[PDB]
Amino acid sequence: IIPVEEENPDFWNREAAEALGAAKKLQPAQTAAKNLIIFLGDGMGVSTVTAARILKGQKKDKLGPEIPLAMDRFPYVALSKTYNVDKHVPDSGATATAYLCGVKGNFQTIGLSAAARFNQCNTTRGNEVISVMNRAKKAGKSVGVVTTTRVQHASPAGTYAHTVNRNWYSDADVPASARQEGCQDIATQLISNMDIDVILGGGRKYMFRMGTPDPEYPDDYSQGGTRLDGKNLVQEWLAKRQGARYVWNRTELMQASLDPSVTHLMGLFEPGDMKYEIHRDSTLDPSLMEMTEAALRLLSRNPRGFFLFVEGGRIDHGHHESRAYRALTETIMFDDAIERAGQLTSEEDTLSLVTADHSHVFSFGGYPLRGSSIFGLAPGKARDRKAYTVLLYGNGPGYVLKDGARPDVTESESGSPEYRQQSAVPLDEETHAGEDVAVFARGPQAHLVHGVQEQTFIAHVMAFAACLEPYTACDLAPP
Amino acid sequence: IIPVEEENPDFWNREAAEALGAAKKLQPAQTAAKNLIIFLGDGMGVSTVTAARILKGQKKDKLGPEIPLAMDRFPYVALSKTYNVDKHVPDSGATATAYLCGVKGNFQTIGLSAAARFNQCNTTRGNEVISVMNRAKKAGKSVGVVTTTRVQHASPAGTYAHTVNRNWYSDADVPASARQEGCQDIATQLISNMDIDVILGGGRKYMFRMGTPDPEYPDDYSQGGTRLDGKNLVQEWLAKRQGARYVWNRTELMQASLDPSVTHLMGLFEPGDMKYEIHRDSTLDPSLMEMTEAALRLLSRNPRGFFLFVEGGRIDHGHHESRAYRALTETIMFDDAIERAGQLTSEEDTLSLVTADHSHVFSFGGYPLRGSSIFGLAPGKARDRKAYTVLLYGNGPGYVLKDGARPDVTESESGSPEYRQQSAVPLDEETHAGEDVAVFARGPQAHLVHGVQEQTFIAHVMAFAACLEPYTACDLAPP
Numbered sequence: 006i007i008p009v010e011e012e013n014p015d016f017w018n019r020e021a022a023e024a025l026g027a028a029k030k031l032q033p034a035q036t037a038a039k040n041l042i043i044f045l046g047d048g049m050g051v052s053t054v055t056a057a058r059i060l061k062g063q064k065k066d067k068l069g070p071e072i073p074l075a076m077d078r079f080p081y082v083a084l085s086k087t088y089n090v091d092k093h094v095p096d097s098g099a100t101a102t103a104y105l106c107g108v109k110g111n112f113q114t115i116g117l118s119a120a121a122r123f124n125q126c127n128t129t130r131g132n133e134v135i136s137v138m139n140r141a142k143k144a145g146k147s148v149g150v151v152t153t154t155r156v157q158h159a160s161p162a163g164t165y166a167h168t169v170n171r172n173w174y175s176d177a178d179v180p181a182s183a184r185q186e187g188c189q190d191i192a193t194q195l196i197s198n199m200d201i202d203v204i205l206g207g208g209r210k211y212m213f214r215m216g217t218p219d220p221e222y223p224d225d226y227s228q229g230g231t232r233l234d235g236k237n238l239v240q241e242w243l244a245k246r247q248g249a250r251y252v253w254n255r256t257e258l259m260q261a262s263l264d265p266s267v268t269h270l271m272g273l274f275e276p277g278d279m280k281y282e283i284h285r286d287s288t289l290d291p292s293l294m295e296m297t298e299a300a301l302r303l304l305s306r307n308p309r310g311f312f313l314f315v316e317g318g319r320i321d322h323g324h325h326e327s328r329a330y331r332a333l334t335e336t337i338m339f340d341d342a343i344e345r346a347g348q349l350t351s352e353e354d355t356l357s358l359v360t361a362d363h364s365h366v367f368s369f370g371g372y373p374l375r376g377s378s379i380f381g382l383a384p385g386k387a388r389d390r391k392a393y394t395v396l397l398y399g400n401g402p403g404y405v406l407k408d409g410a411r412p413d414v415t416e417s418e419s420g421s422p423e424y425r426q427q428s429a430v431p432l433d434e435e436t437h438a439g440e441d442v443a444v445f446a447r448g449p450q451a452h453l454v455h456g457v458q459e460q461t462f463i464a465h466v467m468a469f470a471a472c473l474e475p476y477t478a479c480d481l482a483p484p
Numbered sequence: 485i486i487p488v489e490e491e492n493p494d495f496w497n498r499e500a501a502e503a504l505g506a507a508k509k510l511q512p513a514q515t516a517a518k519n520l521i522i523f524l525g526d527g528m529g530v531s532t533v534t535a536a537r538i539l540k541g542q543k544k545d546k547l548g549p550e551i552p553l554a555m556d557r558f559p560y561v562a563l564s565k566t567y568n569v570d571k572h573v574p575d576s577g578a579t580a581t582a583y584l585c586g587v588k589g590n591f592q593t594i595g596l597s598a599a600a601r602f603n604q605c606n607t608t609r610g611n612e613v614i615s616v617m618n619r620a621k622k623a624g625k626s627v628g629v630v631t632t633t634r635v636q637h638a639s640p641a642g643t644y645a646h647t648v649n650r651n652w653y654s655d656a657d658v659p660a661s662a663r664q665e666g667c668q669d670i671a672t673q674l675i676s677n678m679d680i681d682v683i684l685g686g687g688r689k690y691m692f693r694m695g696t697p698d699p700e701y702p703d704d705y706s707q708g709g710t711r712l713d714g715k716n717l718v719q720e721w722l723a724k725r726q727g728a729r730y731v732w733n734r735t736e737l738m739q740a741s742l743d744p745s746v747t748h749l750m751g752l753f754e755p756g757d758m759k760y761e762i763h764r765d766s767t768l769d770p771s772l773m774e775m776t777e778a779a780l781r782l783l784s785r786n787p788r789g790f791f792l793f794v795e796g797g798r799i800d801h802g803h804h805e806s807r808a809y810r811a812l813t814e815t816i817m818f819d820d821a822i823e824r825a826g827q828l829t830s831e832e833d834t835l836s837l838v839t840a841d842h843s844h845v846f847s848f849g850g851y852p853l854r855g856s857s858i859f860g861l862a863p864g865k866a867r868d869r870k871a872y873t874v875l876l877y878g879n880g881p882g883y884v885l886k887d888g889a890r891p892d893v894t895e896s897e898s899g900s901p902e903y904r905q906q907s908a909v910p911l912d913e914e915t916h917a918g919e920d921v922a923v924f925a926r927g928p929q930a931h932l933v934h935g936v937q938e939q940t941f942i943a944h945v946m947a948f949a950a951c952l953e954p955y956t957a958c959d960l961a962p963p
């Protein structure tokens with residue numbers, strides 16, 4: 006459809022004039038950041054951002070591409086180079102070391118320099134690198150970790166953990182020789198390495214000993230406790246703190262967040278990762294936006310400010326399944342959380358960065374008309390005389406042959422939440438992609454995020470802006 | 485391979501410190517731009533940029549991803565939204581109207597508002613929108629158009645032409661009813677609409693009457709003149725100017741560019757589009773970098789400054805063929821031309837923008853090791869037990885079935901210049917993609933290119949910066 010307002014040049018000339026005046030109005034900060042927030046859309050490359058913008062605009066009553074996402078209103082943008090030291094297409098662990106610790110690492114390791122080697126416990130010590138969240142804590146700030154995946158998953162773990170193997174969620178995953186050598190599982194590192202004021206997401210099962218029934222799924226033994234050492238890490242965390250609370254459902258999270266006297270909050274909403282937003286039980290589980298508001302209610306009480314990590318973690322999972330509906334709906338909730346955090350914090354004293362750890366081999370093609378659904382068929386038939394979708398993958402589990410040929414697809418099929426877009430190469434899981442991802446910034450020192458930069462820049466500008474990490478001697482005025 | 489220097493955190497901490505100091509050193513321009521250059525990588529989306537950076541670094545003796553492209557050193561970056569008014573995944577013509585005229589249009593039309601309709605000659609008049617190159621000419625600047633495609637192809641045509649059908653290269657392409665109604669073919673509009681000081685690229689055949697032998701291929705009749713009206717448009721162009729020269733090969737281009745007394749130069753190097761750089765005859769044809777230096781030698785003589793369009797036009801073609809080797813080598817020469825132009829102009833008085841008109845469904849995946857060739861196989865076999873490449877397409881002509889199954893691929897095969905990467909859907913030509921593309925800027929007012937902007941912003945910031953278009957009353961000091 007062609008909207009009549011856009012047929013007149015003046016529509017476009019007035020828009021661009023407004024754009025110019027807005028651009029001329031921005032000026033850089035001479036002041037420090039009191040608060041730091043990093044919003045991490047896992048797997049949210051440029052193709053993800055544009056497809057999610059279109060979907061979100063159509064959910065409003067619009068055509069799509071013209072309606073800005075919340076992240077699109079951030080004034081400063083840069084491109085970020087993701088390669089890990091050893092591999093050109095990276096994983097979450099080693100990217101986490103770059104954007105949270107400011108050092109690049111080897112694929113599937115977390116919080117370690119590239120002198121460490123994957124799955125080699127004896128190459129850990131002497132290679133630990135410290136996150137900017139650890140440093141904000143050393144400076145007296147309150148610190149929070151919010152995600153839709155397990156809180157021991159790779160991205161959140163980069164804020165507090167140091168490990169040669171991202172798969173060591175609990176001690177049951179760690180080989181006996183590594184346990185003997187002292188390589189602690191990630192759930193142990195979550196309660197032990199540093200003090201974290203707010204911990205919210207999935208991963209209840211790695212905190213309790215084998216045999217402990219899950220509170221939400223007591224009739225499903227596979228959702229129970231995994232530990233081999235008999236420990237209850239939630240209770241050990243709770244015991245070192247006055248005013249600490251543990252929550253496992255939405256109603257207790259929200260009540261706890263309204264209670265001064267709480268001060269420390271661990272909220273573990275599912276045994277493993279949280280449900281995709283389209284499968285969320287809204288009586289039992291908090292959305293990503295609700296977790297981020299809950300975390301901000303607590304974190305904002307500290308007069309010295311806070312550090313907050315907020316992850317749209319299952320964007321990535323949707324792409325691995327080659328189910329763009331799942332990846333795009335998770336991206337819209339992630340943008341909704343960014344908007345919410347923006348309403349609860351001031352850009353005068355809060356540096357907010359939105360980025361992705363890496364991308365996916367996800368593409369938006371064909372030549373669909375303005376206003377058409379993003380999960381639709383491309384206009385016209387392919388060379389094998391069958392329909393094809395505007396959304397596709399390079400590789401992944403949507404590759405299918407039926408009697409030696411590519412299957413035809415209907416519009417009713419292609420718009421289903423379980424639909425897997427086709428790919429050129431069959432893989433159990435679609436792969437990450439190595440192209441640069443965007444960085445969106447606002448707040449004190451956000452104008453330093455510019456151009457084309459290594460992914461370690463994200464960590465370094467946050468520390469500089471709050472005058473942490475190796476940057477006290479920042480030349481900044483108070484927030 | 486893991487480079488030993490990168491195993492030490494200090495490598496990364498020193499790099500980021502340097503990055504911060506550089507970022508702190510930039511300050512905006514209070515002055516106008518004397519010169520304007522727009523570098524247009526046709527089809528050069530973010531995935532193209534990163535794969536081309538890796539290839540270019542490996543051509544030097546490096547690992548790849550760490551080595552900056554010339555475009556990567558531009559201080560200011562933004563994301564650009566490409567949709568056309570009527571279609572979410574755009575074409576070159578209507579994107580050209582947005583980035584050269586500052587108004588969005590309908591797919592496959594050029595220089596017209598969206599009140600015009602594709603292939604409907606009777607919807608042209610009253611809908612013409614003027615380019616910033618036309619306005620720089622009205623202000624007394626010298627103007628140049630340089631490209632590797634036909635100079636009548638969609639992108640260059642956006643600087644001077646107004647048409648409901650980008651396919652009307654010569655009068656032979658225009659239906660008789662449209663000729664009668666006055667819709668002039670693009671080759672006629674090139675010499676007639678406005679005065680252009682330098683015209684360099686392909687498209688010799690549309691300038692001469694049917695029967696005229698091509699100078700470079702006199703023994704191939706299909707490369708000869710196409711016109712139905714008996715005109716010789718090169719001679720008609722040459723006749724209105726004192727000091728105009730026509731050239732068809734490299735040696736005469738370069739000599740003409742060294743001669744004051746020349747002043748107007750039309751250089752048409754191939755009948756249709758120019759050869760890909762890997763097929764270029766270096767005695768007969770100038771590279772993209774040589775055309776841009778030749779154009780700058782002439783354009784720079786004017787004391788009032790110049791406008792210059794420089795297109796890496798066959799990047800796009802390489803992607804349509806699903807031959808990433810062709811798309812990436814054309815991208816490296818395009819970056820080489822950007823570097824060259826940077827050496828021949830000052831950022832103190834020249835606003836330079838690098839962008840793409842849109843992207844392609846091209847992806848860089850698998851999990852290849854650091855330093856591995858970009859045209860290589862991904863580590864490990866796919867679910868059908870056969871190898872797969874790191875580079876793939878969503879759709880396009882690389883889809884193949886041999887006896888009902890996806891073909892295996894060897895490293896010798898995948899590194900060939902004719903190799904077509906596999907795709908999920910067979911199409912004669914791979915499709916454009918609709919995701920946002922990058923904008924890179926340097927020079928006076930370049931700091932106004934920021935954030936997430938509509939593609940019309942490119943045109944509008946150039947006019948503002950040189951105080952043209954609807955922006956005299958710019959509040960800028962002289963360059």
Ligand SMILES: *[C@@H]1O[C@H](CO)[C@@H](O)[C@H](O)[C@H]1NC(C)=O
Nearest residue numbers: 125126127128129130182186
């Ligand atoms: C770690 O143990 C393995 C297996 O015994 C051994 O090969 C390697 O050399 C050890 N490395 C260090 C860092 O001591």
Ligand SMILES: *[C@@H]1O[C@H](CO)[C@@H](O)[C@H](O)[C@H]1NC(C)=O
Nearest residue numbers: 604605606607608609661665
């Ligand atoms: C252009 O001509 C076609 C064919 O006769 C006609 O249908 C259309 O209405 C005409 N349009 C204008 C703009 O007059």
Ligand SMILES: [Mg+2]
Nearest residue numbers: 047097160318
């Ligand atoms: Mg993650």
Ligand SMILES: [Mg+2]
Nearest residue numbers: 274275289290
């Ligand atoms: Mg739950």
Ligand SMILES: [Mg+2]
Nearest residue numbers: 526576639797
């Ligand atoms: Mg072009």
Ligand SMILES: [Mg+2]
Nearest residue numbers: 753754768769
């Ligand atoms: Mg030639």
Ligand SMILES: [Zn+2]
Nearest residue numbers: 047048097362
């Ligand atoms: Zn990830």
Ligand SMILES: [Zn+2]
Nearest residue numbers: 048321322437
């Ligand atoms: Zn992933």
Ligand SMILES: [Zn+2]
Nearest residue numbers: 526527576841
């Ligand atoms: Zn194009």
Ligand SMILES: [Zn+2]
Nearest residue numbers: 527800801916
């Ligand atoms: Zn194209």
